[PDB]
DNA sequence: GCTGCCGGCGGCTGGAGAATCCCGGTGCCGAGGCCGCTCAATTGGTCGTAGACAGCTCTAGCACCGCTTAAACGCACGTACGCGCTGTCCCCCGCGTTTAAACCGCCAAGGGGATTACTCCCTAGTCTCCAGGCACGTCTCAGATATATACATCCTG
DNA sequence: CAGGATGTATATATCTGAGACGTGCCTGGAGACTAGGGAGTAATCCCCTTGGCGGTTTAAACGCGGGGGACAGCGCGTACGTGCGTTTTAGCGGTGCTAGAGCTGTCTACGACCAATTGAGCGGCCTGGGCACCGGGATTCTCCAGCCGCCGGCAGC
């Protein structure tokens, strides 16, 4: 058992403690789809700026600074790594 | 003859000239003033005091010594002011604030 | 061994030295720090060369900043931080 | 003699204190990892990531996942629900200005 | 005897005619006395030009509006036609701006 | 009698049928009784929120009357970017 | 001499060198290059030829010849790619975009 | 005395350049003059602060592209970069 | 009437897992002395943004009656709201298990990054003349009235 | 369950006229003709941190089974929002009329700028010793289901 996608990687009981901590008690059997589809767009959101803003510095390597970059850019400001 | 820094006479631990030097070549204005600096060290000083102070607090409430994200994190939340100040920034190793809906609670 | 960088490292461990004599602080938390006063410097940094640019003037002095705080900082941080932006102009011009 | 178990939805507010409680992160690293590096792979090929340009990506993920999911928590209520359902996940993003 | 409109309807036709037309729905002095009221408190002796009444009211009548469909979408939400002030709430929780 | 004619009681101004006429244009259909003063309060605030930029921008430029020029700076200060008045 | 516009050798409707003077004294760079302003130039003419000619269209199914700010934002708005530009961003005199909820609707 | 700016001469051009008999309102005018304002500013200061980023002291072709990237929703962004470096070369071509 | 009887009622008690505390041992590593360099502070002089004064002057605010139409008040009325009962069937929650994350060790190497010679592109200095801005000045063709028909309702039989 | 009478909307012929669009006039700012000097740019080497590999091992994801409780739906009370007739009240306006703040032009002056010297703030690099961490066991912390005395109906008379 091998074969498998990196989209299904994101688990239900990964899902389930994200949204323990967001707070939910009882959750449906069909937010398991809901959050990785919104995962998923979320995730090209930044990484599509990411990828830009290394084309542009001329770099292979996606920096930390540069996701964020990205992030401030998206009205997502990340501490921790720079500033 | 002997020199000093420029905090010492503004009586600031922020730096004045490093806040200059940073307007000047942050492309902001084509002139700074000589005080905009201090002002703005001020600030900076001020707000870094107070969330410090507010971070502290947690952490000596947590019965620990070394100030930790988690604790700045409820320091940023915890406080309106700063909340408002810092709605759209999150902080890594921050976690959240410990908030459940009275709804979800049981009966008695 | 070379290339230095700079940061608010002593600075931020100097106001938590007069604040909390007998507190630290981790590594992360200060990285941290050191990005929130980059965040509030470029915020308030911008909204004074706006002001500047803004009002046909080209100098940035007290003023400009004065205007950003009150136009950034929330309600009583305004009021403590125009109040401390003062008293610490008023103190340089003081001493020279 | 009987055995002992929990009464359903209890449990769910030990973890619910337990994870508000917690600091790490809430997503294996290396799945993520890979779903961030197979979702550059389409924008760029033979892209590299940093360590910790992984780690910030996924804490912001997971911080902006956990505010959906809070916010996705109030509108279930607002409904006079427990579940959150898919349709509150929606709500919350189209109020939110995300996805219309 | 006489014909009489059902509920919801006339609502319905209001609702199409508002829609379709861009005509300022708030009448101009009620919202500049409020507007220089609201300005006393923050610096005496102001003088309000009617361009900036008019951006303050052009920006006042779109975030109203915007507010009442996002109120409209929690109402709908929740299994309702009417909508109350649990819904504005709601709706602006979640938008950020009482958070 | 020169100046300084204070009123008072004119958020009522903001009347009932042009509440119901501004969700009309939102997209209602039903209204409540009780949500107008929960909107004049928003309104309020907003227009709080809004009036307070706008006059320390014009503080800031030792004017005594505040511009259209100055209402839309302090709307794209707060993300309310507003066109059609010189931006 | 022969004195010859940059707008013309650049094949653009659109004030390059007005562009390239205002990034100078926008205070953006220490220094501005060449291109620059023919890219922002072009990209500027591009996007308002996208919206001028939407909002045209607008006006002539409405039977209307001029354009008024009504059709800007049924241009605007009708567009999904434009809308997401012009999301957080509202026109006076625009109005809204007629849509009701099939909630809303009567049985038949 | 006291001349002004604004983008009405070249708005209106492009008008005629698009639809050569249909035109436009004075209240439109300055609804597009203050677009055009705003998306050159949004424009260039992200290319300012891509420059920034990299600490180069020039902006270039390169960092409008960039920004043009970023800002541009898809559609519009590989458009208008086609459009752009069309007008680049255009404009190199012939000195 | 009044005996039994029958089901609930909640009040309480201890067995049941969970959580916490502290002693005991253990590293790992934020906080501190050292070197020197690199840049920040000092003179010395400039020259040019920005303050003042002095006007002009368009313009925002006040009053004042006539209109009229929207705002406020009432009044049947039926429709949405809220609640209560019900019948599921579908989330939760332990248990066995199957496994895939996580560490730990050793490498090769593409990629990031500091120096160097350079060259050649954006800046700086003047002249010039044409494209943008504005005061008109129109005659418009863009708009707004009042008219006349089709329409979508809500009742009847 | 099919027609008829109705308040709505639709088109359309004049009015009818504020104002987009030339037309010049003017002017100021962008382009054309000269260096120039530092900002990026290949070429080079020098690390480095990155991705890859292969044993354990071990907690976590997973599939199954039971249950009960949250949820959706249907019937019922109800009362409040809604649509419409009746004042009435204040926006709207159009008339002048008033000074007030905006706005521009000049002289001046002082403060931000910038260059050559010189000293120390601090960013780094070890380093000894000090705080966060883990173990097991004793100590509590809640949480749940059965025993029981009490209570209120329930068949008879």
Same mark, same amino acid.
């Given at each position: 058992?091998?074969?498998?996608?990196?989209?299904?990687?994101?688990?239900?009981?990964?899902?389930?403690?994200?949204?323990?901590?967001?707070?939910?008690?009882?959750?449906?059997?069909?937010?398991?789809?809901?959050?990785?589809?919104?995962?998923?767009?979320?995730?090209?959101?930044?990484?599509?700026?990411?990828?830009?803003?290394?084309?542009?510095?001329?770099?292979?390597?996606?920096?930390?600074?540069?996701?964020?970059?990205?992030?401030?850019?998206?009205?997502?400001?990340?501490?921790?790594?720079?500033? | 003859?002997?020199?000093?820094?420029?905090?010492?006479?503004?009586?600031?631990?922020?730096?004045?000239?490093?806040?200059?030097?940073?307007?000047?070549?942050?492309?902001?204005?084509?002139?700074?003033?000589?005080?905009?600096?201090?002002?703005?060290?001020?600030?900076?000083?001020?707000?870094?005091?107070?969330?410090?102070?507010?971070?502290?607090?947690?952490?000596?409430?947590?019965?620990?010594?070394?100030?930790?994200?988690?604790?700045?994190?409820?320091?940023?939340?915890?406080?309106?002011?700063?909340?408002?100040?810092?709605?759209?920034?999150?902080?890594?190793?921050?976690?959240?604030?410990?908030?459940?809906?009275?709804?979800?609670?049981?009966?008695? | 061994?070379?290339?230095? *960088?700079?940061?608010?490292?002593?600075?931020?461990? *100097?106001?938590?030295?007069?604040?909390?004599?007998?507190?630290?602080?981790?590594? *992360?938390?200060?990285?941290?720090?050191?990005?929130?006063?980059?965040?509030?410097?470029?915020?308030?940094?911008?909204?004074?060369?706006?002001?500047?640019?803004?009002?046909?003037?080209?100098?940035?002095?007290?003023?400009?900043?004065?205007?950003?705080?009150?136009?950034?900082?929330?309600?009583?941080?305004?009021?403590?931080?125009?109040?401390?932006?003062?008293?610490?102009?008023?103190?340089?011009?003081?001493?020279? | 003699?009987?055995?002992?178990?929990?009464?359903?939805?209890?449990?769910?507010?030990?973890?619910?204190?337990?994870?508000?409680?917690?600091?790490?992160?809430?997503?294996?690293?290396?799945?993520?990892?890979?779903?961030?590096?197979?979702?550059?792979?389409?924008?760029?090929?033979?892209?590299?990531?940093?360590?910790?340009?992984?780690?910030?990506?996924?804490?912001?993920?997971?911080?902006?996942?956990?505010?959906?999911?809070?916010?996705?928590?109030?509108?279930?209520?607002?409904?006079?629900?427990?579940?959150?359902?898919?349709?509150?996940?929606?709500?919350?993003?189209?109020?939110?200005?995300?996805?219309?």
């Amino acid at each position: 058992k091998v074969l498998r996608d990196n989209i299904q990687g994101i688990t239900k009981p990964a899902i389930r403690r994200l949204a323990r901590r967001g707070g939910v008690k009882r959750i449906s059997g069909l937010i398991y789809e809901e959050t990785r589809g919104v995962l998923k767009v979320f995730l090209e959101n930044v990484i599509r700026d990411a990828v830009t803003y290394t084309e542009h510095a001329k770099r292979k390597t996606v920096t930390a600074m540069d996701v964020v970059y990205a992030l401030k850019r998206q009205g997502r400001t990340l501490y921790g790594f720079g500033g | 003859a002997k020199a000093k820094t420029r905090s010492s006479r503004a009586g600031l631990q922020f730096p004045v000239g490093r806040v200059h030097r940073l307007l000047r070549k942050g492309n902001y204005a084509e002139r700074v003033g000589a005080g905009a600096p201090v002002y703005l060290a001020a600030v900076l000083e001020y707000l870094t005091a107070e969330i410090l102070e507010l971070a502290g607090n947690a952490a000596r409430d947590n019965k620990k010594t070394r100030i930790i994200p988690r604790h700045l994190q409820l320091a940023v939340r915890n406080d309106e002011e700063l909340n408002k100040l810092l709605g759209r920034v999150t902080i890594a190793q921050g976690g959240v604030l410990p908030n459940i809906q009275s709804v979800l609670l049981p009966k008695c | 061994r070379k290339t230095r *960088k700079e940061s608010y490292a002593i600075y931020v461990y *100097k106001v938590l030295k007069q604040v909390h004599p007998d507190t630290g602080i981790s590594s *992360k938390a200060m990285s941290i720090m050191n990005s929130f006063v980059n965040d509030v410097f470029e915020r308030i940094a911008g909204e004074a060369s706006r002001l500047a640019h803004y009002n046909k003037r080209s100098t940035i002095t007290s003023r400009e900043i004065q205007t950003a705080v009150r136009l950034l900082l929330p309600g009583e941080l305004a009021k403590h931080a125009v109040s401390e932006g003062t008293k610490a102009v008023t103190k340089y011009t003081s001493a020279k | 003699k009987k055995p002992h178990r929990y009464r359903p939805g209890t449990v769910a507010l030990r973890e619910i204190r337990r994870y508000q409680k917690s600091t790490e992160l809430l997503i294996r690293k290396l799945p993520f990892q890979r779903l961030v590096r197979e979702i550059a792979q389409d924008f760029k090929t033979d892209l590299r990531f940093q360590s910790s340009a992984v780690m910030a990506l996924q804490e912001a993920s997971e911080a902006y996942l956990v505010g959906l999911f809070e916010d996705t928590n109030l509108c279930a209520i607002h409904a006079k629900r427990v579940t959150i359902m898919p349709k509150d996940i929606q709500l919350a993003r189209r109020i939110r200005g995300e996805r219309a």
